[PDB]
Amino acid sequence: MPAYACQRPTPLTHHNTGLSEALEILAEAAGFEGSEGRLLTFCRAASVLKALPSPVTTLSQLQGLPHFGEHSSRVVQELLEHGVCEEVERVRRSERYQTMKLFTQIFGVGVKTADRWYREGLRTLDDLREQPQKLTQQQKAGLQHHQDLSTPVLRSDVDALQQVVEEAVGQALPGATVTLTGGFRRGKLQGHDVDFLITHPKEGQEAGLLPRVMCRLQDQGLILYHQHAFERSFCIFRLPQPGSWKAVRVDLVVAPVSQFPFALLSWTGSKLFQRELRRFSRKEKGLWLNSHGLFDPEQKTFFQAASEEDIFRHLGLEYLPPEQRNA
DNA sequence: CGGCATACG
DNA sequence: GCCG
Numbered sequence: 001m002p003a004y005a006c007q008r009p010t011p012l013t014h015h016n017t018g019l020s021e022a023l024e025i026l027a028e029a030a031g032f033e034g035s036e037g038r039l040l041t042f043c044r045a046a047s048v049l050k051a052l053p054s055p056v057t058t059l060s061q062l063q064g065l066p067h068f069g070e071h072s073s074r075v076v077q078e079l080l081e082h083g084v085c086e087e088v089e090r091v092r093r094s095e096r097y098q099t100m101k102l103f104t105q106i107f108g109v110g111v112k113t114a115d116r117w118y119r120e121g122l123r124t125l126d127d128l129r130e131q132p133q134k135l136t137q138q139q140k141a142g143l144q145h146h147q148d149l150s151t152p153v154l155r156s157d158v159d160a161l162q163q164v165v166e167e168a169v170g171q172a173l174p175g176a177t178v179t180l181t182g183g184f185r186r187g188k189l190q191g192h193d194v195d196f197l198i199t200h201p202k203e204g205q206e207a208g209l210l211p212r213v214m215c216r217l218q219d220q221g222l223i224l225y226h227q228h229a230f231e232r233s234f235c236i237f238r239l240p241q242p243g244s245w246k247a248v249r250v251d252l253v254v255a256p257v258s259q260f261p262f263a264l265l266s267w268t269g270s271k272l273f274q275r276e277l278r279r280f281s282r283k284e285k286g287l288w289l290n291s292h293g294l295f296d297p298e299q300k301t302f303f304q305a306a307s308e309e310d311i312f313r314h315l316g317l318e319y320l321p322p323e324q325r326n327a
Numbered sequence: 328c329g330g331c332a333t334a335c336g
Numbered sequence: 337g338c339c340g
């Protein structure tokens with residue numbers, strides 16, 4: 001079992017679901033306390049279990065697996081022996097965890113804002129609604145739409161939404177294309193949002209595109225919230241439903257075609273997969289990876305990629321399709 | 328021990 | 337919290 005998640009296939013569904021879920025609770029709680037390192041270790045340990053070919057049934061099967069030391073091994077040991085880990089259950093029921101989870105789930109509220117509200121004594125969404133002078137416009141939209149945004153987006157919803165985005169994109173710039181990315185590209189059946197990547201086959205034509213797209217969608221009455229030159233939009237869209245509609249989070253990103261493989265790789269995820277790939281690139285290969293390119297800081301050159309396959313090859317990694325990037 | 332991903336809004 |  002290699003140490004980086006980008007070195008091994010990780011499918012969406014696997015054979016250690018309960019164990020991985022428990023470790024991810026501890027990872028999430030570590031993040032709420034500001035410990036990024038602990039969060040990463042617990043996330044990495046969970047992801048190792050997702051990559052195994054069969055269920056862990058005995059503690060001895062953890063021997064030699066990366067990211068399993070005394071703490072993660074004890075969690076697994078307790079789940080195997082008793083079906084429950086006391087530390088995990090204590091986190092689950094804790095007021096701190098439940099409130100930080102509730103607050104950070106809001107679009108526009110991160111850990112730092114949630115923590116400050118927690119320390120001020122706030123606990124519920126109605127607590128926040130009763131003090132709207134303390135909210136940004138983004139947070140107000142996140143709070144007004146919180147209920148709809150807490151409902152999973154279905155893969156059945158995605159097709160309808162891609163068609164409306166394509167219509168606006170085609171008027172904004174004929175020939176521009178829309179690609180589904182994020183979790184749905186990795187095979188998820190549900191999501192918290194829909195992620196799209198937009199480009200045009202003629203380098204340079206995509207400059208200035210996203211404002212033109214957003215203005216068109218707003219004129220069609222489909223935008224419930226957006227932030228307004230720009231190239232990324234994190235919006236709330238109106239999606240039709242039987243006799244009504246619901247609010248859905250949609251992310252739109254524009255990239256030049258020369259950067260498209262890098263942007264597609266970056267926005268397809270998973271989040272852990274991308275962090276691990278970027279860490280691998282820098283620490284093992286001495287190359288700096290981001291959503292725009294892959295840089296050699298010694299030669300001061302960028303690697304020209306025509307496909308995600310090119311990028312895996314240039315990092316010396318076996319290619320993983322999106323469905324195997326569910327780290 | 329140092330390190331832990333990344334840039335745009 | 338774990339790796340090198």
Ligand SMILES: O=c1ccn([C@@H]2O[C@H](COP(=O)(O)OP(=O)(O)OP(=O)(O)O)[C@@H](O)[C@H]2O)c(=O)[nH]1
Nearest residue numbers: 182183190191192193266267268269270271274
């Ligand atoms: O902190 C982050 C968040 C997101 N991303 C990049 O943005 C992509 C989309 O980020 P999302 O937050 O939309 O996640 P997701 O689509 O994988 O899963 P859902 O919760 O939406 O179902 C991610 O898959 C990752 O590639 C990061 O690189 N870092």
Ligand SMILES: [Cl-]
Nearest residue numbers: 007316317318
């Ligand atoms: Cl590999």
Ligand SMILES: [Cl-]
Nearest residue numbers: 037040330331
């Ligand atoms: Cl690390």
Ligand SMILES: [Mg+2]
Nearest residue numbers: 182183193195
């Ligand atoms: Mg998504």
Ligand SMILES: [Mg+2]
Nearest residue numbers: 193194195251
């Ligand atoms: Mg998104």
Ligand SMILES: [Mg+2]
Nearest residue numbers: 037328329330
């Ligand atoms: Mg230390």
Ligand code: NA
Nearest residue numbers: 104105106109
């Ligand atoms: Na949030």
